[PDB]
Amino acid sequence: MHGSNKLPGFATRAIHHGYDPQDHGGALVPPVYQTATFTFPTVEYGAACFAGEQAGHFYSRISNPTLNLLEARMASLEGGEAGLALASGMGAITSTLWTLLRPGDEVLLGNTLYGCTFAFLHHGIGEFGVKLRHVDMADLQALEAAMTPATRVIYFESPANPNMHMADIAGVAKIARKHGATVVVDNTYCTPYLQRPLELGADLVVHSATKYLSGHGDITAGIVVGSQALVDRIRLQGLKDMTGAVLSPHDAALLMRGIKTLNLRMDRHCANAQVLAEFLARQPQVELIHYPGLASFPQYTLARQQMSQPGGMIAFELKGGIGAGRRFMNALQLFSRAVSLGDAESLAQHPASMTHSSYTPEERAHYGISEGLVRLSVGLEDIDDLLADVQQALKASA
Amino acid sequence: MHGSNKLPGFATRAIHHGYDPQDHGGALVPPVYQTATFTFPTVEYGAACFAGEQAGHFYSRISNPTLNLLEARMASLEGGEAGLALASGMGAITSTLWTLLRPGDEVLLGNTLYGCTFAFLHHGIGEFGVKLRHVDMADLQALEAAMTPATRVIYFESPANPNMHMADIAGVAKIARKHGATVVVDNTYCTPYLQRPLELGADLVVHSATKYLSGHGDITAGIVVGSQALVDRIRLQGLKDMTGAVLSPHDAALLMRGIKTLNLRMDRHCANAQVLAEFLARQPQVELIHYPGLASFPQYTLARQQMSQPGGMIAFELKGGIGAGRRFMNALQLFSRAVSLGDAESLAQHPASMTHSSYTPEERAHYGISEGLVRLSVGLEDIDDLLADVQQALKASA
Amino acid sequence: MHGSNKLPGFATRAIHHGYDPQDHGGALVPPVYQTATFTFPTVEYGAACFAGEQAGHFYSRISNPTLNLLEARMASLEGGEAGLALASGMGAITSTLWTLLRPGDEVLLGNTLYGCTFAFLHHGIGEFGVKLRHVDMADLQALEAAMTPATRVIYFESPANPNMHMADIAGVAKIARKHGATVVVDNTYCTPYLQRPLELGADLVVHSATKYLSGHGDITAGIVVGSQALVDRIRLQGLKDMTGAVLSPHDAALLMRGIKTLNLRMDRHCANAQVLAEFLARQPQVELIHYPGLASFPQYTLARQQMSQPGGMIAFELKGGIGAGRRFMNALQLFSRAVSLGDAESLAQHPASMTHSSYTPEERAHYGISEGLVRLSVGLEDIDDLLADVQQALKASA
Amino acid sequence: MHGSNKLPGFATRAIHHGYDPQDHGGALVPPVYQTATFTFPTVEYGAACFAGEQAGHFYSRISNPTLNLLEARMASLEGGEAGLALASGMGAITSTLWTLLRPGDEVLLGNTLYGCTFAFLHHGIGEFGVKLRHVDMADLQALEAAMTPATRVIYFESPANPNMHMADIAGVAKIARKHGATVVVDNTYCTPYLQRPLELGADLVVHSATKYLSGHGDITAGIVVGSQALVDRIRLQGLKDMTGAVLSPHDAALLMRGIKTLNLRMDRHCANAQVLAEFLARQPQVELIHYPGLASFPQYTLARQQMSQPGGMIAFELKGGIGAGRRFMNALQLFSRAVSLGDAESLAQHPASMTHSSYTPEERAHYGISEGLVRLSVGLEDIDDLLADVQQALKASA
């Protein structure tokens, strides 16, 4: 029942925000509105709904009550005014960019981006007259310099693969604030529990709820959180007319179920990651480790200023790159070889022999991916079992 | 049998196509793959799956086994090569159009279109440099005269609201074949059971499975069926990168459940609609009726030429105009006042008093919105009850 | 939103009975109350809820809102006052029998019973001091002669496997009314669409909703319909205390989805069964057929008094016995070799070589299990496909 | 992935036990087998499946693949040989006892039992010739004296309400072994994570998975874990014939999803309860406090010998009697007034004014039901929020 406004604690709000059982027959768990359409008692009522004069529903693609609860909750957790639920993280990203951008507009992007986001920008909306430019969001001088009068939005992830490179959200937001640019941050890795970009100046945040938010890898979903003004536009244009990325109320319910243990799951992911990162740091076979929790992390101070905890993701490089990375991966027995992250199950991937195996050392390298870089999404399994798997696989990678 | 093999009938394929229980633990009903990611036995197998040299899965947004079954079944029903499942009908149309059009390209559109696709075209892609032009798809001469070297796509619904105006599919297809253009037909109203555009020459059909295909209004989904070449492209570009309109395996399973009774339900929708249409024709309150089943239907011959049955949708005008339309709508007891269609539950709507109620008679008249036009989605209820509800509502319109 | 607005038709009630969207926010499909517990505004409201003086919920095992809708709808379809939803058909019968019988009580049973019902009666409750006696429910004289002051319950299925033996329900109810016994009829095969035992005098009807009612083989469920007093006792005792066969709100919503097309499906099942039955009758491999639709059916007249249509189940004996039965069964390609019935998918079974393959010809004959009897659950596939399958199977069965 | 009961760790087994993604198309999350029947490739295969010489399913009431994973996983967590999934905790309790006991058998019960379990014992099986006797399972002297050659099973909960009274599980097990009685413990409150009765000597454990195992209050389910020989019997008779309390694969999947965070949720439930119990113990409105985590807890030492943590349940007594409880309960803002427990949401109940408001201080005082007894199911909310709620309610109880 306990609302938000950020009064009750985070765990309380992640469980109760926006829902009062007394308002729904006393049902402790909200009933799921698995219906596409809603009916009107009167024609004058339906009209009032369409004209926004009366609060109600009429069609789930535009708005569904079960989705509305998820949206209100996520908004509360992120500290924003409004939320919007979508069929996937890409759905949230595209619906967002498709409505804020038009030909002639420029979009300043972080140096690296999720593959599909990159693909979408360069071979998608980029091919429709939108200008794109990659800049280091940590370098506020370089950013301020790339700012033009056509820069309409600034988009990036933080941390961003492959080295978990961070950006100065507040620094970026201040520059964008003076230029009239819109800042949107993909806060998938941290979640509102570890980082809240909106509180640092960002205008909007996007999430692939398919990851940590759901936490159990049984749904693909996306979330957008920001001001009412901005979110309304994305709902009514990006979502409604473009993309049509509608989230199933069933999936919205499973996501809210996942969010109920968000703080607890993130606490374990991070606790587990820290021990694994430190164990890796002691391995002679490991050349470099990209984990915000290690004191030698290049952006350690900035990370600590934006994230409450170092996260559950680890990237590291094996000396003797490809081959050691391939042997390692193939020896794993608890960790799963798969793409994705934020599941209870621990996952691992070695781009050099997996996603970018088709490239050549040169291609790969001249593109940012090392030959021995493996990324792990540390799960919730027992740390010693995980350490034992990595230890056994490290011996095999030899 | 079981769908393909020999040449099973429609009902047989609607319930068995693509699935042999023997291949899945003997489960009569296929297990639901409610999973976001899939793992690999080796890094090599993963790379191979990415490169497409290996038949497998890795991420549900790109492809999921439950969705694949639905896709293949729908492809069989439409007489096409391949299918794609999306989060909604709009996800299916936007996904298709985003991958087939680029600035400079021109798309020829039916005279009237579903409200959201119209908004998508004129306020979406159209604002990204794509040329839009509306032509009467029933007028094969005007269509050919509009064909240009820039024409890339011909898109229309058949029948189309609000008069169920038809288009000569085989006709526009031959012109398309002679002048290039790709033909996309929105077959939502008919479903593959009543009309198969691909078999008449269309290249692709899009469906708002949220309607007749699901049949029970508890899901929002979309379908695209066409050549492997075109579908592969829409899957890997429009869905994957530009829309993220991913269908939940849960909803896909529910949709396949609904498709299992497609022929039976459509048969009843049509039978009920015919009786209702013939009944409305003898009523003094009705000024005009738009039902493909009435011999006086302007395109009676073409309709009987393209559709196996006249459908379950009826539109008719009330001599009384908006007031009569409103009074009629408010008096209904069995039919529900709501947008959407194709549910077991009969729905009715009066655009002039509902969606465009705030418009002016002139503004509404301009868009082609009549003052006394009401659209009926004839449900599966007992015809006697429906006739009674309509009768009394007609009397109440006085 | 009818079902009750002046005794609407069967189809109208199977779709709307008990639900008005306007009472649930306009949601066209009812929201699923997938919640275990319910909260109270005051401890006073709670007590009144537990006390029964308050209309509410507190715990789903006792009563749940979506299960309630299904219960009320099923009650309307069978013409009974109350309904109860359970986890399975066996949960419905055991829950029923557990609350009505006590040691010393006598229960007269139909000559034949569903496999598990027989085992529950004979090796279950029957082993807790309750007395059993099997009698031909068609022979009203033998039944009368069987009544004792200890006779508390009369239980049977109608039609009953394996010969579709019918019982004189109105006659049995007469005798029970005189002796003060409760008549419980298993109406699984016919469904309330083809026979309503309560209207012929039975006191309670039980269903394995797993079959025809769901119609799609994706759920296990049971239903009980009868007087409010009887059902209140079965709910508060058989279910909740002696059986914890709670139905999942998800499976209940699925059952209700399936019930929305019950008339349509049963129509097709029977129509398909009729032609297959007559086809079987012309084949020399078939020495005997058990189908209510053939005028040669022994109880053809009685069957036609209680049943609106002859049903979707057909049983027949193959000349050649076991050998031919195995051959026939193993040759099927559309029909699936499995137990159960009532699915869109045609099912077939041969007891002698399947469930009773272990027995000896004599042990089976002793148990009324013929050597060449095969039972078919005629599905919704195209008859031409169904006929071809059995046709080739008969040729192989030779 | 990594199962092996005991090594790997609990969290690892609660996440991976019994499931290797590689065997199911690489699906990270196991596909849900929401099907009622299973088909065979030949009748001889079906026959072997019915004779037990063939591995394979045929009907979900008896056994389902999804339920089987849930079962194997629960068996591992409890350290047992086999598990069984059912529609509810009562389904597990009743299915177990219905197959173990027969007329003439005697059963010794803990002094206090879950409401419906008590009703089932006394007004259910009790009325079928099975003898009952309540003995303090903490008094090994009394238990031994109570033993008789007719004692068939010893049944109890530990902790048990209303004071969280403990039983010496290893103690009663030794006695039971001596005489030859079957010990079954309702381990609902603790979960295999906090207590493993089977490792203490018990023969069977039953759970209301509706509570902590699910953890999110959206499903009703029960679990039985024990020897293979025992569980097989309860499956083939108790569930199959006498109860039919079949668990829906969908609900079993939600259960498994909940179990994936069992350790994390319990850790938090206990941490929160520990803090609330200590606060309550120092409040002037509280006469008594029952929390195993308090050093002053009567059976503190025995509890710590059986439980790894003190649990999330707490009961205390308000000095002001029924009047103080009503005012307390009615003033609760975050805690919900409702029955049940084990949810992410904190629940509270006052038996005197709720479930037993009907009773007079008659048997209420006779069944140990103090007039001021309040039971709290401490949830996962922010402890600061929970403290404030209880604190304010405490003040209002005056």
GROMACS .gro file of C-alpha atoms in nm, chain D residues 103-346:
model
  244
 1297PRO     CA    1  -0.972  -4.789   0.998
 1298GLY     CA    2  -0.824  -4.907   1.328
 1299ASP     CA    3  -0.498  -4.719   1.284
 1300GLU     CA    4  -0.399  -4.466   1.543
 1301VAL     CA    5  -0.225  -4.133   1.485
 1302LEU     CA    6  -0.058  -3.915   1.746
 1303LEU     CA    7  -0.080  -3.544   1.671
 1304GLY     CA    8   0.113  -3.246   1.795
 1305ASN     CA    9  -0.090  -3.048   2.051
 1306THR     CA   10  -0.185  -2.771   1.810
 1307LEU     CA   11  -0.234  -2.795   1.435
 1308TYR     CA   12  -0.308  -2.579   1.133
 1309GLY     CA   13  -0.683  -2.515   1.131
 1310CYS     CA   14  -0.781  -2.720   0.825
 1311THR     CA   15  -0.544  -3.000   0.921
 1312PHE     CA   16  -0.722  -3.021   1.258
 1313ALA     CA   17  -1.062  -3.022   1.086
 1314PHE     CA   18  -0.950  -3.293   0.845
 1315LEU     CA   19  -0.824  -3.508   1.129
 1316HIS     CA   20  -1.124  -3.478   1.358
 1317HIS     CA   21  -1.414  -3.433   1.117
 1318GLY     CA   22  -1.261  -3.609   0.819
 1319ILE     CA   23  -1.048  -3.924   0.840
 1320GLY     CA   24  -1.132  -3.927   1.208
 1321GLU     CA   25  -1.493  -4.004   1.122
 1322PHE     CA   26  -1.378  -4.299   0.911
 1323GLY     CA   27  -1.243  -4.517   1.190
 1324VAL     CA   28  -0.895  -4.375   1.233
 1325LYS     CA   29  -0.803  -4.304   1.596
 1326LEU     CA   30  -0.644  -3.974   1.703
 1327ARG     CA   31  -0.459  -3.853   2.012
 1328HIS     CA   32  -0.276  -3.525   2.073
 1329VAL     CA   33   0.061  -3.554   2.250
 1330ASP     CA   34   0.324  -3.286   2.322
 1331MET     CA   35   0.599  -3.371   2.072
 1332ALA     CA   36   0.847  -3.188   2.297
 1333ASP     CA   37   0.770  -3.438   2.578
 1334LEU     CA   38   0.950  -3.758   2.481
 1335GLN     CA   39   0.831  -3.913   2.806
 1336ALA     CA   40   0.465  -3.852   2.725
 1337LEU     CA   41   0.509  -3.958   2.362
 1338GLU     CA   42   0.665  -4.292   2.452
 1339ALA     CA   43   0.387  -4.362   2.700
 1340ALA     CA   44   0.130  -4.277   2.431
 1341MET     CA   45   0.273  -4.523   2.179
 1342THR     CA   46   0.071  -4.835   2.099
 1343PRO     CA   47   0.099  -5.106   1.831
 1344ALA     CA   48  -0.188  -4.932   1.649
 1345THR     CA   49  -0.003  -4.599   1.623
 1346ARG     CA   50   0.065  -4.581   1.249
 1347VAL     CA   51   0.195  -4.228   1.202
 1348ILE     CA   52   0.310  -3.937   1.417
 1349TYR     CA   53   0.217  -3.600   1.271
 1350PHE     CA   54   0.309  -3.250   1.377
 1351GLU     CA   55   0.429  -2.901   1.285
 1352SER     CA   56   0.749  -2.748   1.421
 1353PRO     CA   57   0.742  -2.473   1.505
 1354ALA     CA   58   0.368  -2.494   1.580
 1355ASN     CA   59   0.122  -2.218   1.658
 1356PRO     CA   60   0.032  -2.020   1.852
 1357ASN     CA   61   0.356  -1.989   2.049
 1358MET     CA   62   0.599  -2.139   1.798
 1359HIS     CA   63   0.629  -2.451   2.014
 1360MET     CA   64   0.902  -2.691   1.899
 1361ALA     CA   65   0.914  -3.068   1.889
 1362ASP     CA   66   1.226  -3.275   1.944
 1363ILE     CA   67   1.221  -3.417   1.592
 1364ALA     CA   68   1.520  -3.644   1.641
 1365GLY     CA   69   1.359  -3.747   1.969
 1366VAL     CA   70   1.020  -3.853   1.833
 1367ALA     CA   71   1.193  -4.015   1.534
 1368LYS     CA   72   1.389  -4.247   1.762
 1369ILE     CA   73   1.074  -4.345   1.947
 1370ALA     CA   74   0.886  -4.390   1.617
 1371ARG     CA   75   1.165  -4.612   1.482
 1372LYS     CA   76   1.139  -4.825   1.796
 1373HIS     CA   77   0.766  -4.896   1.759
 1374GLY     CA   78   0.750  -4.870   1.381
 1375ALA     CA   79   0.550  -4.553   1.327
 1376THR     CA   80   0.586  -4.321   1.028
 1377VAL     CA   81   0.686  -3.967   1.122
 1378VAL     CA   82   0.559  -3.688   0.901
 1379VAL     CA   83   0.642  -3.327   0.974
 1380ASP     CA   84   0.472  -3.019   0.831
 1381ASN     CA   85   0.783  -2.812   0.757
 1382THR     CA   86   0.591  -2.516   0.609
 1383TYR     CA   87   0.711  -2.239   0.841
 1384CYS     CA   88   1.082  -2.323   0.819
 1385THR     CA   89   1.130  -2.446   0.459
 1386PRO     CA   90   1.413  -2.686   0.373
 1387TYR     CA   91   1.640  -2.382   0.395
 1388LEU     CA   92   1.594  -2.335   0.770
 1389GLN     CA   93   1.514  -2.693   0.874
 1390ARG     CA   94   1.538  -3.043   0.728
 1391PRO     CA   95   1.320  -3.286   0.931
 1392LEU     CA   96   1.415  -3.580   0.708
 1393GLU     CA   97   1.776  -3.538   0.820
 1394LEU     CA   98   1.651  -3.543   1.181
 1395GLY     CA   99   1.481  -3.882   1.139
 1396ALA     CA  100   1.136  -3.793   1.001
 1397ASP     CA  101   1.008  -4.011   0.717
 1398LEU     CA  102   0.798  -3.754   0.535
 1399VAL     CA  103   0.777  -3.375   0.513
 1400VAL     CA  104   0.475  -3.193   0.375
 1401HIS     CA  105   0.457  -2.830   0.276
 1402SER     CA  106   0.203  -2.568   0.196
 1403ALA     CA  107   0.417  -2.430  -0.088
 1404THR     CA  108   0.147  -2.161  -0.095
 1405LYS     CA  109   0.355  -1.993   0.173
 1406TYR     CA  110   0.734  -1.937   0.182
 1407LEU     CA  111   0.831  -2.173  -0.103
 1408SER     CA  112   0.624  -1.964  -0.350
 1409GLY     CA  113   0.701  -1.650  -0.151
 1410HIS     CA  114   0.484  -1.422  -0.362
 1411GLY     CA  115   0.131  -1.533  -0.271
 1412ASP     CA  116   0.012  -1.596  -0.625
 1413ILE     CA  117  -0.024  -1.973  -0.617
 1414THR     CA  118  -0.171  -2.242  -0.396
 1415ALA     CA  119   0.037  -2.560  -0.385
 1416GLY     CA  120   0.166  -2.835  -0.163
 1417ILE     CA  121   0.473  -3.055  -0.161
 1418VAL     CA  122   0.552  -3.394  -0.015
 1419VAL     CA  123   0.910  -3.518   0.021
 1420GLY     CA  124   1.022  -3.855   0.150
 1421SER     CA  125   1.141  -4.201   0.058
 1422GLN     CA  126   1.076  -4.325  -0.295
 1423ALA     CA  127   0.869  -4.617  -0.167
 1424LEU     CA  128   0.655  -4.383   0.041
 1425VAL     CA  129   0.606  -4.104  -0.212
 1426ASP     CA  130   0.531  -4.353  -0.490
 1427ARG     CA  131   0.246  -4.486  -0.275
 1428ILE     CA  132   0.111  -4.140  -0.199
 1429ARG     CA  133   0.126  -4.060  -0.570
 1430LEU     CA  134  -0.042  -4.376  -0.700
 1431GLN     CA  135  -0.321  -4.375  -0.440
 1432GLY     CA  136  -0.341  -4.059  -0.236
 1433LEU     CA  137  -0.321  -3.818  -0.528
 1434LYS     CA  138  -0.437  -4.036  -0.817
 1435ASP     CA  139  -0.752  -4.186  -0.658
 1436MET     CA  140  -0.841  -4.027  -0.326
 1437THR     CA  141  -0.776  -3.657  -0.375
 1438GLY     CA  142  -0.709  -3.564  -0.738
 1439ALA     CA  143  -0.530  -3.255  -0.602
 1440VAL     CA  144  -0.332  -3.202  -0.923
 1441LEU     CA  145  -0.092  -2.909  -0.944
 1442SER     CA  146  -0.113  -2.704  -1.265
 1443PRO     CA  147   0.218  -2.702  -1.454
 1444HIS     CA  148   0.181  -2.322  -1.470
 1445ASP     CA  149   0.166  -2.300  -1.091
 1446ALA     CA  150   0.454  -2.548  -1.054
 1447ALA     CA  151   0.661  -2.320  -1.278
 1448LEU     CA  152   0.580  -2.018  -1.064
 1449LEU     CA  153   0.675  -2.222  -0.757
 1450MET     CA  154   1.015  -2.311  -0.905
 1451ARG     CA  155   1.062  -1.943  -0.992
 1452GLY     CA  156   0.994  -1.854  -0.632
 1453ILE     CA  157   1.225  -2.121  -0.496
 1454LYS     CA  158   1.509  -1.958  -0.693
 1455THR     CA  159   1.520  -1.681  -0.432
 1456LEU     CA  160   1.427  -1.893  -0.128
 1457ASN     CA  161   1.757  -1.844   0.057
 1458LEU     CA  162   1.762  -1.471  -0.008
 1459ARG     CA  163   1.397  -1.416   0.092
 1460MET     CA  164   1.424  -1.629   0.410
 1461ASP     CA  165   1.746  -1.452   0.514
 1462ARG     CA  166   1.557  -1.123   0.492
 1463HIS     CA  167   1.238  -1.258   0.654
 1464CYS     CA  168   1.447  -1.366   0.953
 1465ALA     CA  169   1.658  -1.051   0.970
 1466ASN     CA  170   1.343  -0.837   0.969
 1467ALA     CA  171   1.164  -1.059   1.222
 1468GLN     CA  172   1.466  -1.059   1.453
 1469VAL     CA  173   1.458  -0.679   1.467
 1470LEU     CA  174   1.080  -0.658   1.517
 1471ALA     CA  175   1.077  -0.925   1.787
 1472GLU     CA  176   1.340  -0.738   1.988
 1473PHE     CA  177   1.150  -0.412   1.952
 1474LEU     CA  178   0.820  -0.572   2.052
 1475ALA     CA  179   0.978  -0.743   2.354
 1476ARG     CA  180   1.063  -0.402   2.500
 1477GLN     CA  181   0.720  -0.249   2.443
 1478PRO     CA  182   0.492  -0.180   2.746
 1479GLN     CA  183   0.183  -0.288   2.551
 1480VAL     CA  184   0.323  -0.637   2.501
 1481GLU     CA  185   0.261  -0.899   2.770
 1482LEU     CA  186   0.427  -1.191   2.593
 1483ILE     CA  187   0.643  -1.233   2.281
 1484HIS     CA  188   0.698  -1.561   2.097
 1485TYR     CA  189   1.001  -1.552   1.868
 1486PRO     CA  190   1.257  -1.835   1.845
 1487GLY     CA  191   1.530  -1.575   1.796
 1488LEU     CA  192   1.500  -1.432   2.145
 1489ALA     CA  193   1.750  -1.579   2.392
 1490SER     CA  194   1.463  -1.588   2.640
 1491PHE     CA  195   1.268  -1.819   2.406
 1492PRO     CA  196   1.168  -2.124   2.615
 1493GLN     CA  197   1.295  -2.376   2.360
 1494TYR     CA  198   1.572  -2.151   2.233
 1495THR     CA  199   1.837  -2.422   2.256
 1496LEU     CA  200   1.621  -2.695   2.098
 1497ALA     CA  201   1.510  -2.456   1.827
 1498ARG     CA  202   1.871  -2.366   1.742
 1499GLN     CA  203   1.952  -2.738   1.720
 1500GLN     CA  204   1.686  -2.786   1.456
 1501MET     CA  205   1.661  -2.452   1.277
 1502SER     CA  206   1.944  -2.265   1.103
 1503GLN     CA  207   1.763  -1.934   1.162
 1504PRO     CA  208   1.466  -1.831   1.383
 1505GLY     CA  209   1.222  -1.776   1.094
 1506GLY     CA  210   1.001  -1.492   0.982
 1507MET     CA  211   0.696  -1.562   1.200
 1508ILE     CA  212   0.634  -1.388   1.530
 1509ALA     CA  213   0.347  -1.399   1.778
 1510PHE     CA  214   0.297  -1.174   2.079
 1511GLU     CA  215   0.023  -1.091   2.327
 1512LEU     CA  216  -0.120  -0.747   2.391
 1513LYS     CA  217  -0.183  -0.671   2.756
 1514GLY     CA  218  -0.517  -0.511   2.667
 1515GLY     CA  219  -0.681  -0.831   2.541
 1516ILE     CA  220  -0.922  -0.857   2.245
 1517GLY     CA  221  -0.984  -0.483   2.263
 1518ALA     CA  222  -0.614  -0.399   2.223
 1519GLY     CA  223  -0.573  -0.646   1.938
 1520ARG     CA  224  -0.868  -0.504   1.743
 1521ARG     CA  225  -0.741  -0.148   1.774
 1522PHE     CA  226  -0.389  -0.263   1.695
 1523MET     CA  227  -0.496  -0.458   1.386
 1524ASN     CA  228  -0.723  -0.182   1.265
 1525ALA     CA  229  -0.446   0.076   1.293
 1526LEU     CA  230  -0.201  -0.121   1.076
 1527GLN     CA  231  -0.108   0.066   0.758
 1528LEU     CA  232   0.170  -0.143   0.597
 1529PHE     CA  233   0.091  -0.481   0.754
 1530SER     CA  234  -0.215  -0.635   0.593
 1531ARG     CA  235  -0.509  -0.780   0.787
 1532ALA     CA  236  -0.542  -1.127   0.639
 1533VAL     CA  237  -0.470  -1.493   0.694
 1534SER     CA  238  -0.178  -1.686   0.540
 1535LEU     CA  239   0.194  -1.613   0.559
 1536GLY     CA  240   0.524  -1.634   0.372
 1537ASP     CA  241   0.464  -1.347   0.130
 1538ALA     CA  242   0.695  -1.063   0.036
 1539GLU     CA  243   0.418  -0.858   0.202
 1540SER     CA  244   0.384  -0.851   0.579
   0.00000   0.00000   0.00000
